[PDB]
Design an enzyme around this catalytic site. Structure first.
Site, PDB file in Angstrom:
ATOM      1  CD  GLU A   1     145.864 -11.314 -60.516  1.00 13.63           C
ATOM      2  OE1 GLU A   1     146.836 -11.712 -59.844  1.00 13.63           O
ATOM      3  OE2 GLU A   1     145.765 -10.132 -60.911  1.00 13.63           O
TER       4      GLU A   1
ATOM      5  CG  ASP B   1     151.476  -6.987 -58.398  1.00 16.52           C
ATOM      6  OD1 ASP B   1     150.528  -7.064 -59.205  1.00 16.52           O
ATOM      7  OD2 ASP B   1     152.655  -7.208 -58.716  1.00 16.52           O
TER       8      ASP B   1
ATOM      9  CG  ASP C   1     152.732  -7.667 -65.047  1.00 14.10           C
ATOM     10  OD1 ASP C   1     152.640  -6.586 -64.428  1.00 14.10           O
ATOM     11  OD2 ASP C   1     153.019  -8.726 -64.466  1.00 14.10           O
TER      12      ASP C   1
END
Ligand SMILES: O=C([O-])C(=O)[O-]
Ligand SMILES: O=C([O-])C(=O)[O-]
EC number: 2.4.1.161
Lengths: 780, 780
Positions: free
Chosen positions: A378, A375, A443
């Site tokens: 980015e 997770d 999300d």
């Protein structure tokens, strides 16, 4: 002002010298060309290319004002004065540089009038992104709903209605301006990084995608368990809670393959523990036993991991000692304020960072972890002055997650060469699919708008290499009480998209087993259907590994000469045969389905529809979403199991949707051991083929199997073939020449070999499908 | 006139000489005595006794007019003049000879006023058979409904309300007159054979049955698959049809463990082929493949066999050559006209016949046959002049099937010492359960009367040693169209009786998978329930092997001081905790259930009933039959599987029915590998125990496991304990001393360790049940 000065063809690359520098052109295939500007200087390497050093033999021809550099299908036309390159497939202009390369780095191309442009990866802007401008900088968009110009997983790439794909092979903070600022100009910009682009051509959308994945990478077949039911939330707080959830699937009779542990597995709080990368023994006291006990029930364990190591975490001192973290210009570990606390980022671009991080994955995998969740790749926070081994944060940003997947993929293959890695991540780059990346759309809010955006997102990612793109089913972010109708619709859609993983913040249950009786009564048979349909889905996965063909296909594939279809973000194909139209608003009583011209059947009710173009109107109900089956479809099923570890195809049930409008139809079913990463390359599979030939007076099926088979493959499968919309005029059946009578009554109440049900217009054949070819002929 | 002359005590048997001959008395246990008249002559041996040569140490005392021969509990009182023996338990007279032994052979006993007498095996006459006379001659009663004085499986034995069992240990054509001709006289008669009887006493009905099976034989635990779903009809006509039926269970999602092949497996016609005892290759072309393919799907194959070899069959010449058939007085093979044709009978009483028949079973078992069905063992036709090795037909008649089971049992144990034989037969003798005989009630009609008779039959056989007595579910004989409501009721009852085997003549489907949608919707969850309940049923089977305790128990067990309960043939106990009342007439809208005094719950609806004696009135519905759960019950479940080959108990769900009226309750769950015939003797099992202690302010459970375990036993089971009728006043839970809060909301929608559902009055505890003792304490 830029003009041609000279060139040299060797080898097999074209090196052009202009008054402004060198440009290197190399064909990575007959249909794809890499164009590198500033070729004379040191730059970051390609990330998009699976074989960056490739250069196939092309032909160079020269005229007074042009050079031509041509591969099998794609040709680069180089205009000498002023300097400009344009690209042709056959004799058709695909794309032309305007000012081309400037200097920050800048590429400018002409767009054609009417040209429609998909691309940019995850954005919620409309399928055609022409008229839009947006950054190329992977970034979280927490709680997004119905709009986004920038989210987790951007792609510096576009697909045009002219059937080319253009890749900006650059990893840096940048931007894409698709005819927004200037109506006829496509502009690519980056603050730094590689000054290169790649153009890929094709003669159809499937071919384009096949050519694109040929040079950027094909996804290795995932383990079959990746297609099963996942238990997930943010997050199980304890081993007891995790075991209780596995148990709930057992006692509620929902299939379950995998349970997923969010960040509480390594700490009791959301903040302050990230980087521990080890069990919180207070709350997970016997994790090896836990994982072994789950394995006994056919259930895999997946753990979340993140790029960040907090200064408060148990691994900070060691990571610093190991030189595992990105540094500041001064040479110290770079620490910065994340939501979770002050911390640094693991430098996956470095030898030290890779070795350190990889060792931790190896250790946990040895303990019993079956798959991995990465997770915040980015990376979610990434200060501009952060220094990685190969460049600063802004220069490598959009490739961090990509390299992280490569690192983990290599690690897993080294540890378990006989298994297929499962790697689920939020952010990558063009080509990340070659490291098995399975992305999800971040999300998403718990709103209808969040659901209504998922087909657009999935199709955008699917077209540019990511077949397993999916969403947190049911919605993830915020909310205060369950929106029951939304949740149901989301998990129904879930059955017909790549990964079945409901997941949400745990103040509202995300798992279907924790829902009310009505919700469960609706969803249980659908989650079971997901498993019954494994031969259909797993076969589409096989095709995705072979050719890049996405599991979800856009409506526009149905008519490549109708560019208006490109705008459709509401109906899509799940595999070849199912046209799916998710319900994405509350209380919808009917839907208008823009079914392509032809014959279609209601998947749920068997109703036959025919259309010459006008859409089909179907009523809705709460227990299904509208799904139409294409005439000529072979829909294969096996009995439902609770876990893919128990998967068997000894019993097959196949439904063929007959219509005289389809005189020839083909189906295939790919079977292997569900786990061998080398099954395809070594032909260790059992590939079942079905061919229907439908004429005025006969319907015949030719069945065959190829491949070397595999351990545990059934020699003979009991097969029930159910022919929908079957003629009531078939008098006899020949099986390999042996004539058999067709009963005309009591089909459901006798062990009949061949029986026609007049009320349902279904003809059922029951037989043994062994290793030899089988021909079944029905005749009037 | 008969009187005592002298006696000799040795050893340890009493040998009495009267003016009419010798009588030998021997205790086979402290509670059971064998009494042999004409002891001086050569007679057939005992068939009823498991250890015929046993004789435990008893005490002999003499007075002027009596001898007393006494064991631990049972005493024989021998009156000298006139000679008469009577039997006492403690100081209570159980049974007294009248004229005792006469000569044909004849025994005459007094019956006491008010004494009620069960027995005779299969008859439909009323539970108390006193006032009835009937033959002892095993004989078919094709198409019986609501009455029979003579059917397939008679037993020369009775059970009295005085709590003794009397066995006439004689195998010959005979009769029983239970106070019919003379109100106070029980008369036993036989044309020939052994002149002996055995009396067994007990202090309760369970003890009586334990003592009876101790000396006649205990049933070895059947393979667990015997408790699963059987596919059967008369009969699958081909391998294709058989495979299609297995496939139908898969595609209709009904559990299936075993498919059963009637007589078409060896011939295309009903007549003319019996004795072939080999595959009809025209219709079953690849039987080894067929059986192997079924095994791959966890499905066993059982074949029918019969005692008769037709002169038209392929094995006639060989059987004659082998001297395998019974002979006539002249010495030739005896041939006679059966329904199926002219033929003889295999002499299982001979060495030659046994070796010949056994070799055939061995051969077929090696090919893949998993279990065996022996039909027509009365024998159905048995001419009086037929000569067996040890006597003529009339002398050995009622023991033919018994010896046939012994032969087959020995054969199977010799071939597969690590498996439990499955032997299903129609006719036997007292003690046949020791050869694993699983009897069914023959060719019952497809009528409500046929169904309404099954509880009476099952209880009569269960009480005298046969725990696995069952019926052809749905009805077997004749009929022209399905009686749907009857069929449904029969298969519902089926779930709660020993063997789940629907079977009928194939002009009407007997398998549930061939029924209409409504029928399947009703029966599917019930056949699945059968599998979910395996821990309950298999534990009762374990107890049956241990103590002879039948799986079905009569209502009268509930109050041994209320003899009127003996008449009840309409409600029965399935295991300890379920009171079942089958619906046995069409359109019944409600039932009156004579529940014993106490607290009872509706199994389907959780409704709590309390009664001090008056019956309970419950409404009926088509989808269930009325079943009440006894307060204090622990009802254990595992997830449904399709075949017991896939059985796992990694996940347990246990329902405890709490009520303050039951301050102490116990439950047990017996787990082993489902297949090892030696698991009990070697302690290769996992015996789970549960104890509830229920006081005003606390409810606590003590959980433990004993046994050495077995290969594949789970170390830790995820357990969900659901406490019905739980107090709403429990504030906390301690697990082994660790205090845990009890949630009071959202029990179905959270992974809670302990939660109380106020609307359902259910308290659910979810935990891990490992190898160490576990204490769970709830406190107000
Ligand atoms: O296909 C046909 O010809 C029909 O439906 O009768
Ligand atoms: O058992 C109890 O005391 C109750 O139900 O409250």
């Amino acid at each position: 002002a830029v003009f041609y000065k000279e060139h040299k063809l060797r080898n097999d690359g074209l090196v052009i010298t202009t008054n402004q520098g060198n440009i290197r052109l190399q064909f990575k295939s007959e249909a794809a060309i890499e164009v590198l500007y500033r070729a004379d200087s040191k730059q970051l390497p390609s990330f998009a290319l699976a074989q960056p050093e490739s250069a196939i033999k092309a032909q160079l021809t020269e005229t007074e004002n042009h050079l031509q550099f041509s591969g099998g299908t794609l040709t680069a036309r180089i205009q000498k004065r002023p300097f400009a390159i344009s690209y042709y497939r056959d004799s058709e202009l695909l794309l032309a540089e305007e000012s081309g390369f400037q200097v920050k780095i800048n590429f400018r191309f002409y767009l054609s009038p009417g040209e429609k442009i998909l691309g940019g990866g995850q954005r919620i802007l409309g399928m055609d992104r022409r008229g839009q401008r947006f950054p190329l900088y992977n970034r979280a968009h927490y709680g997004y709903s119905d709009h986004s110009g920038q989210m987790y997983f951007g792609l510096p790439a576009i697909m045009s209605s002219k059937q080319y794909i253009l890749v900006f092979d650059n990893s840096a903070s940048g931007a894409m301006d698709i005819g927004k600022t200037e109506s006829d100009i496509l502009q690519l910009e980056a603050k730094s990084g590689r000054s290169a682009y790649i153009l890929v051509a094709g003669n159809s959308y499937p071919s384009l995608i096949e050519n694109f994945t040929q040079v950027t990478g094909r996804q290795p077949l995932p383990p079959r368990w990746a297609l099963g039911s996942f238990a997930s939330r943010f997050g199980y707080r304890s081993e007891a809670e995790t075991r209780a959830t596995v148990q709930k699937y057992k006692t509620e009779d929902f299939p379950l393959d995998t349970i997923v542990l969010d960040l509480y597995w390594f700490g009791k709080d959301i903040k302050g523990h990230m980087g521990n990368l080890d069990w919180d023994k207070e709350n997970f006291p016997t994790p090896l036993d836990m994982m072994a006990d789950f394995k006994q029930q056919g259930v895999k364990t997946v753990l979340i991991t993140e790029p960040f190591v907090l200064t408060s975490s148990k691994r900070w001192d060691d990571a610093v000692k190991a030189k595992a973290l990105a540094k500041d210009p001064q040479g110290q570990p770079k620490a910065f304020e994340l939501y979770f606390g002050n911390g640094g980022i693991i430098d996956v671009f470095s030898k030290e960072g890779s070795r350190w991080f990889s060792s931790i994955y190896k250790d946990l995998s040895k303990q019993g972890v079956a798959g991995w969740w990465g997770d915040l790749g980015e990376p979610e926070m990434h200060p501009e002055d952060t220094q990685h081994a190969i460049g600063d944060a802004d220069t490598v940003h959009n490739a961090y997650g990509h390299r992280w997947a490569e690192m983990l993929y290599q690690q897993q293959l080294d540890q378990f060469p006989e298994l297929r890695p499962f790697i689920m991540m939020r952010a990558g780059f063009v080509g990340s699919q070659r490291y098995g990346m399975i992305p999800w759309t971040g999300d998403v809010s718990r709103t209808w708008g969040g659901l209504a955006s998922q087909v657009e997102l999935a199709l955008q990612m699917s077209l540019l290499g990511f077949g397993y793109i999916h969403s947190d089913l049911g919605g993830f972010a915020d909310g205060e009480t369950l929106d029951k109708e939304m949740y149901i619709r989301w998990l129904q859609y879930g059955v017909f998209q790549p990964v079945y993983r409901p997941h949400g913040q745990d103040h509202i249950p995300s798992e279907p087993v924790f829902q009310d009786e009505e919700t469960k009564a609706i969803l249980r048979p659908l989650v079971k259907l997901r498993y019954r349909m494994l031969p259909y889905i797993y076969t589409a996965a096989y095709q995705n590994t072979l050719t890049g063909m996405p599991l979800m296909r856009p409506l526009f594939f149905s008519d490549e000469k109708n560019p208006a279809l490109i705008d459709n973000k509401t109906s899509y194909f799940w595999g070849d045969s199912l046209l799916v139209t998710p319900i994405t608003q509350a209380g919808v009583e009917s839907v208008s389905i823009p079914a392509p011209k032809g014959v279609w059947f209601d998947f749920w009710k068997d109703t036959r529809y025919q259309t010459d173009g006008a859409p089909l109107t179907l009523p809705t109900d709460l227990h299904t979403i509208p799904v139409l089956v294409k005439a000529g479809a072979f829909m294969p099923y096996v009995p439902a199991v609770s876990t893919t570890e128990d998967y068997r195809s000894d019993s097959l049930e196949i439904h063929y949707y007959a219509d005289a409008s389809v005189p020839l139809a083909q189906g295939e079913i790919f079977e292997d051991d569900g786990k061998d990463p080398n099954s395809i390359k070594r032909n260790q599979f059992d590939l079942l083929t079905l061919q229907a030939t439908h004429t005025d007076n006969q319907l015949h099926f030719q069945l065959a199997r190829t491949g070397k088979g595999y351990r545990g493959m059934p020699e003979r499968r009991a097969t029930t073939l159910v022919i929908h919309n079957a003629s009531d005029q078939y008098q006899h059946l020949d099986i390999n020449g042996k004539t058999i009578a067709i009963a005309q009554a009591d089909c459901a109440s006798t062990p009949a070999l061949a029986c026609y049900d007049q009320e349902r217009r279904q003809l059922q054949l029951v037989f043994t499908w062994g290793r030899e070819a089988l021909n079944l002929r029905l005749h009037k």
